Nucleic acid binder design. Structure first.
Ligand SMILES: Cc1cn([C@H]2C[C@H](O)[C@@H](COP(=O)(O)OP(=O)(O)OP(=O)(O)O)O2)c(=O)[nH]c1=O
Ligand SMILES: [Mg+2]
Ligand SMILES: [Mg+2]
Ligand code: NA
Length: 385
DNA sequence: AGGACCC
DNA sequence: GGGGTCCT
């Protein structure tokens, strides 16, 4: 009545898979996908040579001299594949939540229940798992929660087979009773495998983490807070004072993350649907000062207008984002947004009006005389209607 | 407009 | 990096 069956689907090395498919000459070769000076991801043949995700490019060559690099700055193809994955999952069950370009959650509860109603009860004893059971736990076929999670593992196997057969992509899946545990357990056997978590092994999974930052929803800021309070292990967080936690983190963070530490997560799988925003970025070391900016902003706009135009919906808010330096200081970018004028929402002719909007938002932020040094320009369209 | 989080 | 999400 309360218990869900959730699957987390997590594609392997995603950008590298897409590049490997584009150029099968790279299939047997160690491969990294480069963005500026970063190897943002690499295929499992590069990982075996000590190439790590988000390793810089000199370190990466220094580790594996023969490593092949492919430019991954233009995300168009990865983004297109990513939506082909999500739509394929949506055909299984429509409630699909995207997390970045390579992870999806699906709530399988209704689908599991319909499949169980189809079984005759002399076939119920015949239910088997597909893939790994976390911690090698024994299955009890008389336990309705175990039966539901096994049928979840069968649907997950079907999704994985369909993504390989229809899109050429491999990935892992985790099946569990909520999104936290599904995300945690999907990564236990990789690459290209799947795992199911039965309820009795939840504490073993959560305590398998080695630090609280590994819990999804606890990020850099929050972990740094916790560390300062002497909270380091999952058990530290489980046993820490609710009241002190509430004072330090506010009631919202405190109550939610302490529930995470126990494996409890009541958040629903939300149907992502079409995106809420479209943006593009470009990074540089001080290659923008000044009115080398309008050109860059023109190029970003050019590309973004194609995306909105192919999307079909129209954006009512535009935003310009910059980043300043130096020297070694703080993360924060700065932005300005305003509505797009009504006549302009009708996709020189579109460019000159939008660039002029953008250049004005530009001035509001940057004093074009007595100037400051830029490391990033980004345009974002949002408020899609 | 900026902050936290996610990939 | 080069994207995204939602909340304050
Ligand atoms: C975390 C992260 C991922 N990405 C991109 C590169 C990846 O192909 C996609 C990576 O998301 P992930 O699922 O973290 O990684 P993956 O698909 O590369 O690797 P793994 O097999 O362990 O799952 O996101 C970034 O560009 N910046 C980031 O900070
Ligand atoms: Mg992932
Ligand atoms: Mg992945
Ligand atoms: Na985390």
């Amino acid at each position: 009545a309360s218990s869900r069956v959730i699957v987390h689907v997590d594609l392997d090395c995603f950008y590298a898979q897409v590049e490997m498919i584009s150029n099968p000459e790279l299939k047997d070769k160690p491969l990294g996908v480069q963005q500026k000076y970063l190897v943002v991801t690499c295929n499992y043949e590069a990982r075996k040579l000590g190439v790590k995700k988000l390793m810089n490019v000199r370190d990466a060559k220094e580790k594996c001299p023969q490593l092949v690099l492919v430019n991954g700055e233009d995300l168009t193809r990865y983004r297109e594949m990513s939506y082909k994955v999500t739509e394929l999952l949506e055909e299984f069950s429509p409630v699909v939540e995207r997390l970045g370009f390579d992870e999806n959650f699906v709530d399988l509860t209704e689908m599991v229940e319909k499949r169980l109603q189809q079984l005759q009860s002399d076939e119920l004893s015949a239910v088997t798992v597909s893939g790994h059971v976390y911690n090698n736990q024994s299955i009890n076929l008389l336990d309705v929660l175990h039966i539901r999670l096994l049928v979840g593992s069968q649907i997950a196997a079907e999704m994985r087979e369909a993504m390989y057969n229809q899109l050429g992509l491999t990935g892992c899946a985790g099946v569990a009773s909520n999104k936290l545990l599904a995300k945690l357990v999907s990564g236990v056997f990789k690459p290209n495998q799947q795992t199911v978590l039965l309820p009795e092994s939840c504490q073993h999974l959560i305590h398998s983490l080695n630090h609280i930052k590994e819990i999804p929803g606890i990020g850099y800021k929050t972990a740094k807070c916790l560390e300062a309070l002497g909270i380091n292990s999952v058990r530290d967080l489980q046993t820490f004072s609710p009241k002190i936690l509430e004072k330090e983190l506010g009631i919202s963070v405190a109550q939610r993350i302490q529930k995470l530490s126990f494996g409890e997560d009541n958040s629903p799988v939300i149907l992502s649907g079409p995106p809420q925003s479209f943006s593009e970025e470009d990074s540089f070391k001080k290659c923008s000062s000044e009115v080398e900016a309008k050109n860059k902003i023109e190029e970003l706009l050019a590309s973004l207008l194609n995306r909105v135009c192919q999307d079909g919906r129209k954006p009512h808010t535009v935003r310009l984002i910059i980043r300043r330096y130096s020297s070694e200081k703080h993360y924060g970018r700065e932005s300005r947004q305003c509505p797009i004028p009504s006549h302009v929402i009708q996709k020189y002719d579109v460019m000159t009006p939008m660039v002029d909007i953008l250049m004005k938002l530009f001035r509001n932020m940057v004093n074009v005389k007595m100037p400051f040094h830029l490391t990033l320009l980004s345009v974002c369209f949002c408020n899609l209607k």
